[PDB]
Design a protein around this ligand. Structure first.
Ligand SMILES: O=C(NCCCCCNC(=O)NS(=O)(=O)c1cccc(Cl)c1)NS(=O)(=O)c1cccc(Cl)c1
Ligand SMILES: O=C(NCCCCCNC(=O)NS(=O)(=O)c1cccc(Cl)c1)NS(=O)(=O)c1cccc(Cl)c1
Lengths: 319, 317, 318, 317
């Protein structure tokens, strides 16, 4: 049977005999993603260039996600890459869920038409206190659901829950996300490594060693290929589909990495683990870091389990 | 005033007082590109998954059929076809078109940016058309460019008048002129190549890359980007400046990318925008091909960056 | 706050504390209507004319049929396109019965006339093995009904116990946007709608009523006339602007022409939930007890003052 | 071979060996029609209803701006503008365009079919451009037609070569030629007018309509259709044959529809398709206008039906 994201989520909700709140949240999120996708592909750009005689895409995308989530009545605390403090849903619209999201990841270079994406992680509120920013300071282990939308050659929604990872293709002719890849698992070992090698002068020695081994294998195996889009959603999705490893590690100038834990690293780590992959800071699983600031950064190395394990050995070899 | 690709091409054609043949060719290609874009964004994919109870082939078929029916072409060379296609006499025009209909498609399973690359030559002789009519150096190009199917779809068209960039508005199926007479930065800060082949790198490439990470003039090290889809990496080079490299390695001693419908169109776009494109030994556009599918090494982009590579290259003789 | 059909239906279901089965049905139907709309607007027609070198009513039927079966919410399906009721296979059976016209008005789609999808939704009432008889319930038993109009824009009108709500399809995002809430028809309109080409066959009551619209005996202004000849388009105008719509019996159609199960009953339900009326002349459309799934009925529907004025003329002629 | 409106128009222009000015006009109008269709189908309406927290004026702006920026027009007359619009000198071309940007829009609240109607003239004098350049009889038309925004969007284009119908494919923004050199039936079976105004009918209209419903012989009575949107009713008349009437009466001795941008374009399409269009007194196309907004009675459609109406009409004259 054909399956849509709408039908899939609804049926998962009936199996769990839930109240319908999480289904409303996800339906609302899916609608924002379709609207973001439409704007990213530049529908209506003729009007901006005067065909009949405005907001940047990252601002518009943040507005789309914020309003659809607020009006879902399913959320109470919202953290966005775009906002310094967490948004507290007003009382009449409050639900039980906390959502951390990056509304248009990779948009800083969208002038070159690079792939971009939306990343989200969804938690249930743990305290009975009045909702506050503190409710977003949970470890990734507490995620109820996470995933991303990739606006690439086509638009795809990847949704991870306890049931596994499922991939839905947006058919723009009808505005429906079509389930095309069920219960996805990552390869045990890949053949692609992904990081910005231009910063080689600042690499940690374990990172230097690991990359040198990918290019000059000591066991006479074939050297890995290299890919680095520079858009996390695009690089991470390719890692899921083809296997391999993705690194944005800590270094001398950036002991905490550059990517953001709450709405970049935690969702991608959760997608990876539900797909049989791994995601580490070097010191521990990304999902086990207990955050103290909603915008705090984290190092991240993620992907096929054999590859992440090989990186960790090199990291531990350097103490 | 707003400008469309259709209106722009028509008006250029009226300026040259041409017969309208090239305008018809370019119009047909523009239609093919919009149809490819629609398929790449997966419009109608629900029908494939049973709602009512191949992409590189379709892309080739779209370009082939639109160019044939334009009545403007006589010889068509595609990455997909072993031999050149000869247009039947009743639909034969005077132009020769080399194209890559869905460049980067080998990895489209991960939704990487993909694109269509095309180069257009005029056939001058009165001989019966043949594959040999496509064996021209890039210097002979009448027009070239690409369509990038990335976060949005854009057509970049280079001609004698320069380089112009048109954004596809999917709401009305119109390419809107958004960047006129584009020129590349004199010098950039991003280098682009597959460093997985480092063990097989030519000594000049190894040193040049070392200069990007550890600059000799105490400048900041370049960032690295490599999408692995030639159209995406080359378009970023155009917009942000910098350098793109696909040099020879052990698996590809003449490089990997194809001269006729990958390197030459991109070399032409680069040169019309104030950039450079070299094999190391000569300008790509000066290579005289002997095989429609022959490969070439290519280093292209901002002029200061390519000149810096060439200095390193000449240092290794 | 902005509201979508998906969000609207889900919230009604949470208020009713239902199992989610009817929401699954409606979501599936909403998906089919968007696919029908895309095909009706001729997306992809360039491929049919050879750009790379099913009939619309059949495709529309297949879209509705397959989306409803795979919803797991239906057991019996009646369509204008199928001679007999479709019985949903045992593993996919739900509790609802759906009668629908997948592309109403398609006989003149050659001139690009507005066309539409009409549907009526019942709960299966008998405990017998599902059969064509499960669709022979009077319209009074409808749980939900409505239509999609593929006109200048695509609109879905959904009527339920909570009232009538209208959603505009935004094709940029494949989303039905709530634009008119808890809609009510005007008490009295100024437009009458029927095929006057059958004037020679009209019964005396229709002849008099139409004469009153053109030459009003109180010397008020004559009604204007509109007749698209596509029921969804004419009924939708009647809902939005008021007035009256008539397709009475004639010599070629002595039992009327429109179909009771999936044209007259869904439109009667929308009209009554919007404060309007729908009569055969002898009784409310919704009270007719069907005996055959494709049976026809005469229908007079629209603003309550207008239908009541017609019924007075009808009783005057006995 | 597949054919698009863009390719079709270009080829007609190459056969006529023209300067390309009329082709640029038609391309610009086609683009405006795709943008009108997108707004009429309500693309982007979610933003208007607050997803991120007028139509006839927009349609008029779209046509006006695309025609102005074509450099092919000098005088523009629209149903939406009180006076003729004079194109600024630097953008002036040789054509005069009369149009209704969104005919039928007054009832667009009910999602009734709507349309754009246009007629294109060559400027006849060398005088400074003015409203007077639009006061030509329909006989002087170079091109006319309409776009119907119905169940699908179709552009009907009438020229000296005949009437051709192009279906808009929204997936790629291309008008695809689907019905070539179309001719209307000699005689139809449908009559189309607002019978709610029966008490004010001219006696000839009363008798003629009564004959359609109660034929004096053994023929079948005609069916009746009246959408109330001229483009929708005229297009059905073209496809199915029959007759469409908006005739004169004592209270409206000149009819209601407008000669320059409703009656004349539809008359030209009908006559090129082998049909007829009369005021009752003369051919619509032979009326010489004195006012850009003047009205004209119009009876049009299959020639046997129009002649029969004139027989009844002259009996009461
Ligand atoms: O989805 C959840 N539950 C199923 C949704 C049903 C609730 C709403 N009820 C109805 O709609 N009823 S009805 O009969 O159709 C009806 C009644 C009246 C009018 C109408 Cl129109 C329709 N739960 S959950 O927590 O979100 C969840 C849990 C686990 C995983 C996931 Cl992914 C989500
Ligand atoms: O495009 C070129 N020339 C433009 C001239 C258009 C030819 C078509 N003629 C008309 O359209 N005539 S008309 O009056 O409008 C007319 C008349 C009757 C009916 C109709 Cl419907 C229309 N030349 S070129 O070599 O292709 C070229 C050269 C350089 C760069 C480029 Cl990019 C292309």
């Amino acid at each position: 049977d054909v399956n849509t994201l709408t039908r899939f989520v609804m049926e998962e909700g009936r199996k769990a005999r839930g109240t319908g709140e999480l289904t409303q949240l996800l339906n609302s999120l899916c609608t924002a993603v379709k609207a973001i996708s439409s704007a990213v592909r530049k529908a209506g750009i003729a009007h901006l260039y005067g065909i009949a005689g405005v907001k940047k895409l990252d601002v518009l995308s943040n507005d789309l996600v914020m309003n659809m989530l607020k009006s879902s009545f399913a959320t109470c605390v919202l953290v966005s890459e775009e906002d310094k403090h967490a948004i507290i849903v007003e009382p009449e619209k409050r639900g039980k869920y906390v959502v951390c999201f990056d509304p248009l990841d990779g948009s800083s270079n969208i002038d070159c038409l690079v792939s971009v994406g939306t990343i989200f992680g969804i938690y249930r509120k743990k305290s009975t206190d009045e909702p506050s920013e503190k409710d977003a300071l949970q470890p990734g282990r507490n995620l109820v659901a996470a995933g991303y939308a990739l606006y690439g050659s086509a638009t795809m929604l990847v949704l991870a829950m306890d049931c596994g990872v499922n991939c839905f293709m947006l058919d723009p002719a009808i505005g429906e996300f079509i389930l095309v890849d069920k219960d996805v698992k990552i390869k045990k070992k890949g053949k692609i490594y992904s990081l910005n090698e231009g910063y080689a002068k600042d690499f940690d020695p374990a990172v230097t060693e690991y990359i040198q081994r990918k290019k000059f294998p000591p066991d006479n195996s074939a050297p890995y290929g290299a890919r680095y889009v520079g858009s996390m959603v695009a690089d991470v999705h390719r890692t899921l589909v083809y296997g391999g490893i993705f690194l944005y590690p800590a270094n001398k100038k950036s002991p905490n990495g550059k990517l953001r834990l709450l709405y970049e690293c935690n969702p991608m780590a959760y997608v990876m683990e539900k797909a049989g992959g791994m995601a580490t800071t070097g010191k521990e699983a990304v999902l086990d870091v207990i955050p103290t600031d909603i915008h705090q950064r984290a190092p991240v190395i993620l992907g096929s389990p054999d590859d992440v394990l090989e990186f960790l050995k090199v990291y531990e070899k350097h103490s």
